[PDB]
């Protein structure tokens, strides 16, 4: 099975049928065995395109609702609100699918420090996408569970990964964005992004060219977010 389930995921990727790529990769993730770097990348790409399409529609429908809330008719708003709540229901079903796969199968099975930092980042991100659209108590619980997951990734990453490593840079990028957006602490967001960028600058001279070009791309995303948040 495993080598053919990966091939069905590679066909569904090129066909752009990501909902069939997800079922192919979820079957591989359920085996309780260490996934290769290729299989980790296929699993992320699958869920990330499936959730990403729904997030974009939810922002557009929410934006339309805020323009219609300038004294538009309450029946028309009731229809827009029923349609927005349907898209929020799909985001809940996609997040609770991957979070259950991560908790039961992937996080307990992982042999290596790179593997555990990657899966605690996925758990941090999929809890963070619930905190984008939830309100009241359920935004508090999503923000708590996301914060705990990014801390656990960070505490391991400091032992297991160089400060120039793409996974350790990507963790600081997503975790600083979580402080700016979800908790709304722009000071903590700047401090974390600046510290991670400064720790990288010290070591680029040690890298090969094909490593250097990969690390520096994520450092440029840190420069851009810092430039924006400083204003």
């Amino acid at each position: 099975d495993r080598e053919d389930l990966v091939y069905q995921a590679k066909l569904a990727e090129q066909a752009e049928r990501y909902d069939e790529m997800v079922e192919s990769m979820k079957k591989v993730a359920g085996m309780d065995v260490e996934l290769t770097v290729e299989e980790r990348n296929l699993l992320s790409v699958a869920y990330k395109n499936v959730i990403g399409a729904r997030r974009a529609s939810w922002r557009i429908i929410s934006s339309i609702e805020q323009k219609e809330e300038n004294k538009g008719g309450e029946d028309k708003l009731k229809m827009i609100r029923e349609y927005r709540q349907m898209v929020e229901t799909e985001l809940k079903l996609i997040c609770c699918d991957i979070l259950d796969v991560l908790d039961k199968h992937l996080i307990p099975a992982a042999n290596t420090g790179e593997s555990k930092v990657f899966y605690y980042k996925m758990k941090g991100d999929y809890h963070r996408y619930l905190a984008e659209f939830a309100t009241g108590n359920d935004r508090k619980e999503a923000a708590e569970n996301s914060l705990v997951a990014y801390k656990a990734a960070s505490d391991i990453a400091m032992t297991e990964l160089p400060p120039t490593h793409p996974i350790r840079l990507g963790l600081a990028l997503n975790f600083s964005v979580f402080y700016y957006e979800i908790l709304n602490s722009p000071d903590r967001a700047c401090r974390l992004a600046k510290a991670a960028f400064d720790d990288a600058i010290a070591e680029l001279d040690t890298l090969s060219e094909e490593s250097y070009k990969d690390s520096t791309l994520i450092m440029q995303l840190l420069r851009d977010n810092l430039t924006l948040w400083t204003s």
Partner: peptide, 7 residues
């Protein structure tokens, strides 16, 4: 406007 990691 803020950027998370691309794929």
């Amino acid at each position: 406007r803020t950027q998370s990691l691309p794929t």
